[PDB]
Amino acid sequence: MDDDQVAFSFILDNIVTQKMMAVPDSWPFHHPVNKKFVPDYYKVIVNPMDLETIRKNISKHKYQSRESFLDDVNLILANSVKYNGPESQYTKTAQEIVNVCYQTLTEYDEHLTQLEKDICTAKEAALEEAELES
Ligand SMILES: Cc1cc2c(-c3cncc(CO)c3)cnc(NC3CCN(CCCN)CC3)c2[nH]c1=O
Ligand SMILES: Cc1cc2c(-c3cncc(CO)c3)cnc(NC3CCN(CCCN)CC3)c2[nH]c1=O
């Protein structure tokens, strides 16, 4: 419940909604696949991912650094490559979602590094506090 984790999560939620979800024709990736339009989806894809699941994860503060966040963004691209193939319009769009995500992280690199560094410090400060109690 530290202010650095709250600020970091807030930044990630903003990148998702304001930049990634704003990618033209990205709407099929904004929510989990609807099994009606794609009956064999969950047979083919073992680990499904979408922009809504990521926002729910951000809300639960799953991501303490941009790397675990990147693992879930990259899983969206790899799922599209497997299910629709590399030539698919769905994969080209998934790739564009990934490119804008990396671009926004690059643009906010110093802010994010500082927050990641502060989240790390708060966790270490919490453990030394639980040792001074005796
Ligand atoms: C069939 C379809 C759905 C859809 C859904 C959608 C689909 N399923 C569920 C839900 C709700 O939970 C939403 C969401 N946004 C769409 N497109 C808009 C078009 C205008 N864009 C801005 C352009 C600015 N000049 C932003 C995206 C969609 N376009 C579609 O063709
Ligand atoms: C995210 C996604 C959606 C999608 C939707 C779709 C569109 N509107 C709404 C909804 C509701 O979720 C889904 C429809 N057809 C897709 N692509 C085809 C499916 C058949 N494939 C052959 C596989 C044979 N084993 C070739 C590519 C989709 N592929 C996707 O990756």
Swiss-Prot record:
Signal peptide: none annotated. It is found in: Nucleus. It comes from the Eukaryota. Phosphorylated by casein kinase II in vitro. Residues 2-108 form the Bromo domain. The Bromo domain mediates interaction with histones that have acetylated lysine residues at specific positions. The second domain also recognizes and binds histones that are butyrylated and crotonylated. Belongs to the TAF1 family. Component of the TFIID basal transcription factor complex, composed of TATA-box-binding protein TBP, and a number of TBP-associated factors (TAFs), including TAF1, TAF2, TAF3, TAF4, TAF5, TAF6, TAF7, TAF8, TAF9, TAF10, TAF11, TAF12 and TAF13. Interacts with TAF7; the interaction is direct. TAF1, when part of the TFIID complex, interacts with C-terminus of TP53. The TFIID basal transcription factor complex plays a major role in the initiation of RNA polymerase II (Pol II)-dependent transcription. TFIID recognizes and binds promoters with or without a TATA box via its subunit TBP, a TATA-box-binding protein, and promotes assembly of the pre-initiation complex (PIC). The TFIID complex consists of TBP and TBP-associated factors (TAFs), including TAF1, TAF2, TAF3, TAF4, TAF5, TAF6, TAF7, TAF8, TAF9, TAF10, TAF11, TAF12 and TAF13. TAF1 is the largest component and core scaffold of the TFIID complex, involved in nucleating complex assembly. This is Transcription initiation factor TFIID subunit 1. It comes from Homo sapiens. The gene is TAF1.
